[PDB]
Structure 1
Amino acid sequence: MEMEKEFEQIDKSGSWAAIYQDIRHEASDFPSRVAKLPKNKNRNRYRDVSPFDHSRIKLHQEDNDYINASLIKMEEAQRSYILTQGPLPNTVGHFWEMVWEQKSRGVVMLNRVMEKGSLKCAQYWPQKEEKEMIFEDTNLKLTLISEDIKSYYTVRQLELENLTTQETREILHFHYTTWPDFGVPESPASFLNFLFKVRESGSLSPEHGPVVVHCSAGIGRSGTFCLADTCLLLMDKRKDPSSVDIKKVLLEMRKFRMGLIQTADQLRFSYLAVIEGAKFIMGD
């Protein structure tokens, strides 16, 4: 069923809450035993959001390999993503260790550091060129090289140095700066524009490690980004939007991380973004 007609059918019947609960009911349930170990309690932002054991990212250290991060591997689309929580004060060094070890070229941030007067994530990157950050626990140095500010998003060029070997790499930071907490973007237009910028950078391409994507919990806004990208890519591979079932793609992604898409409104927005984005893929 053309999703654009499935969309109008759900809208006119006001059944978004009903579709969403059906997904919640059919979603995979896998063990998260490492996340729940007592030694890891201060590595988790939210007690109810944990990576599955089978798909969790392992840190390359003997001490404690744990981070709240999952590998989402989309076999037909040939895209991979790492979805992770907003870093905590004690996990900013783990965060940059993961980017280094996984060979990522992009970090995608969909939240502000403050929303609702609570810190949704640590200030984990430098704000001024001349004030670099050193992560003593993981032996990394991070420097701001350049910043480009637009109205609702900013891009940054960062330099990450492995202080152990003195190798350096260029990391691109894509910061979507106007997406409300457990909300939806102002318009499919600004979201998709932002998406088409990450895609142009090379950050999603198979020559690099997987893109790191986060919000506060790494499931809601983060879920919407990878779901829209994969659905549009599938359209591209088969040049046939008719063939894509957004609900089936979401359940496939939920085999690798729990809770992706946190509200019925986030599900409705995901449909809107894919429908409007398709008007580019099919040749306009």
Structure 2
Amino acid sequence: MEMEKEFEQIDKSGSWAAIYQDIRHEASDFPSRVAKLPKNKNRNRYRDVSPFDHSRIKLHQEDNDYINASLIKMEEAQRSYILTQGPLPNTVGHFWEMVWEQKSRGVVMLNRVMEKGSLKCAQYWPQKEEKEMIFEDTNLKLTLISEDIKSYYTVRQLELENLTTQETREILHFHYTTWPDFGVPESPASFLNFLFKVRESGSLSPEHGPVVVHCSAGIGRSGTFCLADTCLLLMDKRKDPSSVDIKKVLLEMRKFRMGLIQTADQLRFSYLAVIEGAKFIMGDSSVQDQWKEL
């Protein structure tokens, strides 16, 4: 079926939970043996969220190459993403090592450091220009260059230096700061405006390594971001946009990391975002200026 009318049919029939459970039943199951080794217990935030062995990012290090991160490679859309957990106190150095080694330009953060009164990830970037960060275990230095705080998100420019070679690179940090503690946003307008800002920066383009995207576990909000991006790209590429099947794209992405889209509400929100975004793309360029007002 098409998307917008499949949508109204699930709303009127109140069957989002049944649709979402079907996806869970059909999703791939692949081994994650490296994640479960005892030496990696303090490298995982959640015991039930692990990268598959076949798609995990390897650190370039002979002692322990493990990080809880997965490469999602979308063949038809020609987009790749790295989805990862929020860094832990003992993995912030690994996190920036991965950014360096994979040649990423951008980092997409969809959570706050504290939510629901608990810590959801480490404070892994510097908050003041004059107070840079040194990661001694991986030999990297990180400096805040500038910061632009808007109503729904903040963009930061960061300098990452490999202290071994004295090479430096500019990393863009895109921080969506207004996802509610419970549930999903009532309108997708600010999330889509945020997605378009990431796109406009070059961070999703083939001349760079894959964007690094995270929330707390790296499967829920993070899955919503890459699912919406990929579906909209396919609608622009194909002769028949109504042939894009959001459930099939989600199952394809779940071949690469478990658990993407954590609730039936996140699934419905993903539909809403793709539907509204397809109107602004066209050919409705004026659509854009509208997301930024509402």
| SS in structure 2 of the partner of residue 251 of structure 1 | helix
Structure 1 residues 249 and 211 mapped into 2: Cα distance closer, same or farther (>3 Å)? same
Structure 1 residues 239 and 147 mapped into 2: Cα distance closer, same or farther (>3 Å)? farther
Whether the aligned pair in 2 keeps the contact of 1:182 and 1:262 (CA below 8 Å) is no
Output the CA distance in 2 between the equivalents of 1:156 and 1:163.
22
| SS in structure 2 of the partner of residue 236 of structure 1 | helix
Output the CA distance in 2 between the equivalents of 1:56 and 1:182.
29
Q: CA deviation at 1:193?
A: 0.1
| SS in structure 1 of the partner of residue 248 of structure 2 | helix
Match of 2:37 in 1: 37
Over the matched positions of the two proteins, sequence identity in percent amounts to: 100
Of stretches 264-273 and 177-186 in structure 1, the one that deviates more from structure 2 is 177-186
* Superposed structure 1 runs of 4+ greater than 4 Å apart: none
1:155-209 deviation per Cα after TM superposition (whole angstroms, max 9, x unaligned): 0000000000000000000000011246312421000000000000000000000
Structure 1 residues 182 and 103 mapped into 2: Cα distance closer, same or farther (>3 Å)? farther
Whether the aligned pair in 2 keeps the contact of 1:2 and 1:241 (CA below 8 Å) is no
Match of 1:118 in 2: 118
Superposed counterparts of 1:66-105, under 5 Å: 66-105=66-105
Structure 1 residues 113 and 239 mapped into 2: Cα distance closer, same or farther (>3 Å)? farther
Whether the aligned pair in 2 keeps the contact of 1:239 and 1:282 (CA below 8 Å) is no
Output the CA distance in 1 between the equivalents of 2:172 and 2:223.
20
| SS in structure 2 of the partner of residue 160 of structure 1 | strand
1:255-280 deviation per Cα after TM superposition (whole angstroms, max 9, x unaligned): 00000000000000000000000002
Output the CA distance in 2 between the equivalents of 1:257 and 1:38.
21
1:124-154 deviation per Cα after TM superposition (whole angstroms, max 9, x unaligned): 0000000000000000000000000001100
Structure 1 residues 239 and 150 mapped into 2: Cα distance closer, same or farther (>3 Å)? farther
1:67-111 deviation per Cα after TM superposition (whole angstroms, max 9, x unaligned): 000000000000000000000000000000000000000000000
Q: CA deviation at 1:226?
A: 0.1
Whether the aligned pair in 2 keeps the contact of 1:182 and 1:220 (CA below 8 Å) is no
| SS in structure 2 of the partner of residue 72 of structure 1 | strand
Output the CA distance in 2 between the equivalents of 1:243 and 1:196.
23
Q: CA deviation at 1:239?
A: 5.0
Output the CA distance in 2 between the equivalents of 1:40 and 1:239.
46
Q: CA deviation at 1:2?
A: 1.3
Q: CA deviation at 1:238?
A: 1.1
1:226-277 deviation per Cα after TM superposition (whole angstroms, max 9, x unaligned): 0000000000111532010000000000000000000000000000000000
Of stretches 179-188 and 87-96 in structure 1, the one that deviates more from structure 2 is 179-188
Whether the aligned pair in 2 keeps the contact of 1:133 and 1:141 (CA below 8 Å) is yes
| SS in structure 2 of the partner of residue 190 of structure 1 | helix
Output the CA distance in 2 between the equivalents of 1:242 and 1:182.
32
| SS in structure 2 of the partner of residue 141 of structure 1 | strand
Q: Unaligned regions of 5+ residues in structure 1, if any?
A: none
Whether the aligned pair in 2 keeps the contact of 1:129 and 1:146 (CA below 8 Å) is yes
Output the CA distance in 1 between the equivalents of 2:180 and 2:98.
27
Q: CA deviation at 1:10?
A: 0.2
Q: State the TM-score, normalizing by the size of structure 2.
A: 0.95
Give the aligned length. Answer: 283
Output the CA distance in 2 between the equivalents of 1:181 and 1:35.
28
Whether the aligned pair in 2 keeps the contact of 1:241 and 1:278 (CA below 8 Å) is no
Match of 1:274 in 2: 274
Of stretches 173-182 and 256-265 in structure 1, the one that deviates more from structure 2 is 173-182
Q: State the TM-score, normalizing by the size of structure 1.
A: 0.98
Output the CA distance in 1 between the equivalents of 2:168 and 2:145.
13
Whether the aligned pair in 2 keeps the contact of 1:111 and 1:181 (CA below 8 Å) is no
Whether the aligned pair in 2 keeps the contact of 1:106 and 1:174 (CA below 8 Å) is yes
Q: Unaligned regions of 5+ residues in structure 2, if any?
A: 284-294
Of stretches 266-275 and 240-249 in structure 1, the one that deviates more from structure 2 is 240-249
Output the CA distance in 2 between the equivalents of 1:242 and 1:185.
25
| SS in structure 2 of the partner of residue 128 of structure 1 | coil
Output the CA distance in 2 between the equivalents of 1:110 and 1:165.
32
Q: CA deviation at 1:116?
A: 1.1
Whether the aligned pair in 2 keeps the contact of 1:108 and 1:212 (CA below 8 Å) is yes
Output the CA distance in 2 between the equivalents of 1:186 and 1:99.
33
